[PDB]
Design a protein around this ligand. Structure first.
Ligand SMILES: C[C@@H]1O[C@@H](O[C@@H]2[C@@H](O[C@H]3O[C@H](CO)[C@H](O)[C@H](O)[C@H]3O)[C@@H](O)[C@@H](CO)O[C@@H]2O)[C@@H](O)[C@H](O)[C@@H]1O
Ligand SMILES: C[C@@H]1O[C@@H](O[C@@H]2[C@@H](O[C@H]3O[C@H](CO)[C@H](O)[C@H](O)[C@H]3O)[C@@H](O)[C@@H](CO)O[C@@H]2O)[C@@H](O)[C@H](O)[C@@H]1O
Ligand SMILES: C[C@@H]1O[C@@H](O[C@@H]2[C@@H](O[C@H]3O[C@H](CO)[C@H](O)[C@H](O)[C@H]3O)[C@@H](O)[C@@H](CO)O[C@@H]2O)[C@@H](O)[C@H](O)[C@@H]1O
Ligand SMILES: C[C@@H]1O[C@@H](O[C@@H]2[C@@H](O[C@H]3O[C@H](CO)[C@H](O)[C@H](O)[C@H]3O)[C@@H](O)[C@@H](CO)O[C@@H]2O)[C@@H](O)[C@H](O)[C@@H]1O
Ligand SMILES: C[C@@H]1O[C@@H](O[C@@H]2[C@@H](O[C@H]3O[C@H](CO)[C@H](O)[C@H](O)[C@H]3O)[C@@H](O)[C@@H](CO)O[C@H]2O)[C@@H](O)[C@H](O)[C@@H]1O
Ligand SMILES: C[C@@H]1O[C@@H](O[C@@H]2[C@@H](O[C@H]3O[C@H](CO)[C@H](O)[C@H](O)[C@H]3O)[C@@H](O)[C@@H](CO)O[C@H]2O)[C@@H](O)[C@H](O)[C@@H]1O
Ligand SMILES: [Ca+2]
Ligand SMILES: [Ca+2]
Ligand SMILES: [Ca+2]
Ligand SMILES: [Ca+2]
Ligand code: NA
Ligand code: NA
Lengths: 292, 292
């Protein structure tokens, strides 16, 4: 089953992502194949999958940037029918915007079937061109046709996945308590995490006893990622992953505040020092408190 | 004994505070009597008292605004000697900048005696004028002379005072844990707290599911007070009081994030809702976690 999340949806046949052209919020904005760069924010190519309760394996697909929904034009079962961005809502009954997503015959890629037409999201002719038409097209759940097969490359973690990542870390103090703020988190590439840090002005901040010390840097960095989240994305129903941790050294005589993020595989945490922008597998403190 | 803290130092005879003229960081900036407004930030009139270890009841007095020290000019024991702002350090051995502060004969006001000259901070002639000379002057620990008597009006709380304030509150959840970030906190009048909130742009922010919801507003408000702290004050060795709390309703089925501050008497907390700028004795949640 596809879990609730943010996915980069990549064609199984050619290296083309599902892309809402120019990220435009206009109704009828064409959704097309476009090339992508790994370990970046592919700004027009992220999709919030929202499960519809009481309809098995069916979702809305919301462009994280535009806040508009993958829409099969007039819900036509005709092959070649336009797939566009269109205004809607996460739990809409509009079947132009409802998508049954289940594993392809290869067991790793998915097919995307319009709930109303029962036709499939097709990268027309397997065209690897930037701006290649994606359409609703006749097909079957079992065939190998790669025009209609899509890797759902997962870009978010549930809170529960975040917890699992922290609990797998060997620098957690015996007294650790974690405070969970949200349910679903876009995981940032370090390159993006670092850019948000630079854009916060924190690289310019100086350490000052109590008035601007490690707790002030850690919380400024979490607030800056929360600000960036609301200012960058028009979709709702997710947060941006950026943790705060208070830690203690081995001697038990020094406390420090810092940030953490997750690895590309989402399986482990990495510590971030907001006073120099370093990433570390070991920051020299054992976390006794985190919030994220 | 005077505790480590930030004090508004007010003459016992007339309503004049010790004021570093124009808050100037220039060496030899005159320190004078000036009128004040209660329940405001008196920007040039706050003094960080730092106890010197191994010298009983003796302190540096650092202007919170200027980051410069109360300085008896050339340490002269002559009556009429200038008291100025001067560059120095919190644990200086320069006795021009060391002050023995102990209760006056009335048991409530203090006398301020230069550790080197043994002469007293005197509001010359009890002059209530704005800009009235303050000087080192001959005197005795026991006399009633109000020119030389000073109420130390305490503006900070220790972390321990903050804890006592929270523990006195009746909206603390059974599972509550408090995470202490600093040691000494300037307590803001609501009028100032509110201004920092308005100046953060938070009144303009909209509630968005997970992407900018109550946790995002609470942490943006704490970061904005930390920013205001470093940008407003040149002294070090204190923080600005602004709490974050996560709470749960009576039903146990809803969690909310909010801020809190302290009362003017420092004895109790007040909840702040950063989504509407309201202050409340009861926000409808019992705090299970705070950091401050
Ligand atoms: C059958 C038809 O469904 C709705 O119209 C859809 C479009 O729906 C969506 O956009 C419209 C505004 O253009 C509206 O906001 C609606 O709530 C939203 O779901 C859309 O799917 C287009 C393109 O495929 O096709 C239909 O026109 C509805 O608005 C109509 O009244 C009517 O019931
Ligand atoms: C290369 C080509 O692959 C298959 O055709 C696809 C199309 O496939 C889909 O539509 C056809 C009807 O045109 C049929 O219903 C099939 O079951 C279904 O997967 C479609 O992907 C289009 C648009 O991109 O491209 C190809 O024409 C196959 O049917 C052809 O014989 C041939 O092997
Ligand atoms: C006896 C004298 O003490 C020091 O001088 C003080 C002044 O001291 C302070 O400012 C100077 C720079 O002007 C310097 O930064 C020093 O570290 C700091 O404590 C000051 O108290 C003035 C006014 O009362 O009087 C003396 O000039 C020291 O610098 C001198 O070398 C000398 O030891
Ligand atoms: C009104 C006045 O009060 C007292 O005099 C103060 C001064 O008092 C202090 O200095 C005098 C020496 O001039 C003396 O040493 C005294 O013990 C000490 O408190 C002083 O505060 C000045 C500057 O403001 O103003 C007054 O002159 C008292 O001695 C006077 O007789 C008279 O009652
Ligand atoms: C916001 C904008 O993002 C990039 O341009 C997008 C583009 O993005 C993808 O394609 C480019 C090459 O054209 C790279 O592979 C990126 O890794 C992809 O994310 C597409 O989304 C198209 C179609 O919507 O629109 C462009 O705006 C970037 O090149 C721009 O500089 C800018 O950052
Ligand atoms: C920063 C500056 O603060 C105020 O002016 C100060 C002034 O402050 C005190 O006196 C005024 C009346 O003159 C009020 O009672 C205030 O409550 C006091 O804090 C003094 O500190 C003098 C001497 O240093 O300098 C002025 O700058 C305020 O009036 C200004 O508008 C401004 O906010
Ligand atoms: Ca939340
Ligand atoms: Ca701090
Ligand atoms: Ca601290
Ligand atoms: Ca949130
Ligand atoms: Na469902
Ligand atoms: Na001492």
């Amino acid at each position: 089953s596809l879990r609730r999340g943010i996915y980069h949806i990549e064609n199984a046949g050619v290296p083309s992502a599902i892309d809402l052209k120019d990220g435009s919020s206009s109704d009828g904005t064409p959704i097309v194949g476009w090339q992508f760069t790994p370990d970046t924010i592919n700004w027009h190519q992220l999709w919030l999958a929202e499960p519809i309760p009481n309809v098995a394996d069916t979702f809305t697909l919301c462009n994280l940037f535009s806040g508009t929904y993958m829409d099969l034009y007039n819900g036509s079962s005709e092959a070649g029918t336009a797939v566009n961005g269109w205004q809607g809502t996460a739990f809409t009954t509009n079947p132009h915007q409802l998508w049954t997503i289940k594993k392809s015959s290869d067991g790793t890629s998915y097919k995307i079937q319009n709930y109303g037409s029962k036709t499939f999201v097709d990268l027309v002719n397997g065209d690897s061109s930037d701006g290649a038409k994606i359409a609703g097209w006749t097909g079957t759940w079992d065939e190998g046709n790669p025009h209609q097969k899509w890797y759902f490359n997962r870009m978010s973690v549930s809170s529960a996945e975040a917890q699992a990542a922290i609990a797998r870390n060997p620098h957690i103090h015996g007294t650790y308590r974690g405070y969970i703020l949200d349910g679903e988190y876009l995981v940032l590439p370090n390159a993006t995490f670092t850019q948000i840090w630079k854009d916060s002005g924190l690289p310019g901040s100086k350490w000052r006893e109590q008035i601007y010390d490690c707790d002030d840097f850690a919380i400024a960095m979490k607030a800056a990622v929360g600000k960036w989240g609301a200012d960058s994305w028009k979709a709702n129903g997710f947060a941006i992953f950026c943790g705060v941790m208070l830690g203690v050294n081995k001697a038990g005589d020094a406390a420090h505040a810092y940030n953490f993020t997750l690895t590309k595989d989402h399986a482990d945490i990495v510590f971030f020092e907001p006073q120099n922008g370093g990433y570390l597998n070991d920051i020299g403190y054992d976390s006794y408190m985190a919030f994220y």
